[PDB]
Assembly symmetry: C2
């Protein structure tokens, strides 16, 4: 059972609703960060920042941000200190996001998949373990040190 | 996007070299941020940070980071202040990245595509204009203000 913070603008709103329901039915704990209603003009960043911020502050939790393509949404989430947000467009990329990147969040594009395909991506994301392999942690640590100082690490 | 900065560790190295040659042939000026040779044990974050820093610092340029899935790479690029790196897994997402997100960079997952498919993603990325539409700029501006200040914008 995993706690999952969800965020979405209008383009991901309907898919967010379905994911919340799906996560409840599969034994997880969805927390809705908004949008709470459909508003065709609303702006994704605030919802994605909210989901990623809450995810980072609640270790062990995951997050999912939803939009049209998911790309604006993952970009926004990645601006949050300590957040790692992959774009999941397949079961394989969702699983690898966890296994290799230890991503706490994924973005999904609601306009890119059927509901069936989106829920399978979610399933892979919420069940795949972080591998803890040395090279993966080393790379996470390098990026984290860059995030701390914004001093670009030298290339070999 | 005529100057194009590219970065990849070993996992994206061969595809990066193929893309550099393709960009030369289509009239662009690819700039290799590294890796300059295949080294099985190198780490992507420095190359992706270098590519994103140099892209953001160079008006009118674009950047591409290549990996296995591309997800670690776009996460790294997105930690650079001012950078917007989408994950492009199709011609449609590469185009939308420019049109909606004004993404200066994309990540591509070389293991997820044939070379032909990958070069077509690249073509869409470097030819699709930024829309300059009000709502898209408004969303970029909100994110840029969050990067400046780390005050999460209020949720409606």
């Amino acid at each position: 059972g995993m706690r999952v913070y969800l965020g979405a603008d209008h383009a991901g709103y309907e898919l967010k609703q379905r994911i919340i329901e799906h996560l409840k039915q599969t034994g997880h704990e969805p927390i809705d960060c908004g949008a709470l209603r459909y508003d065709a003009d609303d702006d994704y960043p605030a919802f994605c920042i909210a989901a990623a911020t809450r995810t980072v502050a609640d270790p062990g939790s995951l997050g999912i941000v939803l939009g049209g393509s998911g790309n604006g949404e993952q970009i926004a989430a990645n601006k949050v200190p300590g957040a790692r947000c992959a774009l999941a467009w397949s079961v394989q990329t969702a699983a690898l996001a966890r296994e290799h990147n230890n991503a706490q969040l994924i973005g999904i594009g609601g306009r890119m998949h059927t509901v069936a395909e989106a829920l399978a991506i979610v399933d892979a994301f919420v069940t795949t373990p972080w591998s803890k392999a040395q090279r993966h942690q080393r790379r996470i640590d390098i990026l984290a040190e860059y995030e701390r100082t914004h001093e670009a690490p030298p290339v070999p």
